[PDB]
């Protein structure tokens, strides 16, 4: 998250911190995800597309910190790593950039809702907030494009939903942005999701309800003028989410 603010998982308790175990045992942060049900973390396929082996993944819920334990955090293996079969990613856009991680602790349990572990409502289908709506994005992604490190501390920021019209403008993303994506950016482009925020939630309040409107998917750079964050428009993937979480 470029700019925005540090936060803790209490402020995004559906936020799933998804890591990959490497051969050699190193565990790197992959992406955010959002707990959309106790067993289901939704994230971005691109986060996993190159390493689709579920066994490599560790999902934490209740994690406010990237490389240290957060009290009450839950560690999950990924029982199912469901990538969107229509995922595509050239050039820039990541299409159908949505992934489901069925999470299962070593105790065979899903997320146990706690102060730090909560699900995020999926939007009702094709029900997204209007452009200009401020939504939050959360992640452990880079705080600066040029950063090598991810923040240790979860961050959130607020970006405003950008209309598809605005976002497909050539000087934005042209046709890279689809209706299955939501662009969001800061008006000053000063804050944004960034690398490592992928998969994470774009949460809007569709009034009254914190709603997983978007999944951090892609963008050119981060907090780059005319380059919004692009989010998988979750409300356009409910059938897919439904058909895969049943």
């Amino acid at each position: 998250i470029i700019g925005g603010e540090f936060t803790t998982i209490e402020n995004q308790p559906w936020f799933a911190a998804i890591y990959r175990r490497h051969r050699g045992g190193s565990v790197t942060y992959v992406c955010g995800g959002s707990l959309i049900s106790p067993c289901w973390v939704i994230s971005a396929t691109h986060c996993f597309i190159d390493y689709p082996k579920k066994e490599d993944y560790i999902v934490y819920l209740g994690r406010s910190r990237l490389n240290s334990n957060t009290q009450g955090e839950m560690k999950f293996e990924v029982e199912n790593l469901i990538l969107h079969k229509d995922y595509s990613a050239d050039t820039l856009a990541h299409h159908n950039d949505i992934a489901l991680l069925k999470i299962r602790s070593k105790e065979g349990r899903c997320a146990q809702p706690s102060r730090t572990i909560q699900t995020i409502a999926l939007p009702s289908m094709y029900n997204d907030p209007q452009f200009g709506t401020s939504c939050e994005i959360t992640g452990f992604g880079k705080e600066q494009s040029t950063d090598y490190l991810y923040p240790e501390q979860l961050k959130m920021t607020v970006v405003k939903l950008i209309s598809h019209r605005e976002c497909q403008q050539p000087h934005y993303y042209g046709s890279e942005v689809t209706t299955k994506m939501l662009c969001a950016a800061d008006p000053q482009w000063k804050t944004d999701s960034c690398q490592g925020d992928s998969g994470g939630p774009l949460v809007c309040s569709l009034q009254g309800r914190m709603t997983l409107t978007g999944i951090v998917s892609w963008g050119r750079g981060c907090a780059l003028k005319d380059k919004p964050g692009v989010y998988t428009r979750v409300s356009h993937f409910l059938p897919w989410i439904r058909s895969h979480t049943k």
Binding site: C31, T146, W218
Partner: peptide
């Protein structure tokens, strides 16, 4: 690769 979309990518 320094971009969202290439997290956890083989290259990158």
């Amino acid at each position: 690769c320094s971009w969202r979309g290439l997290e956890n990518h083989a290259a990158c």
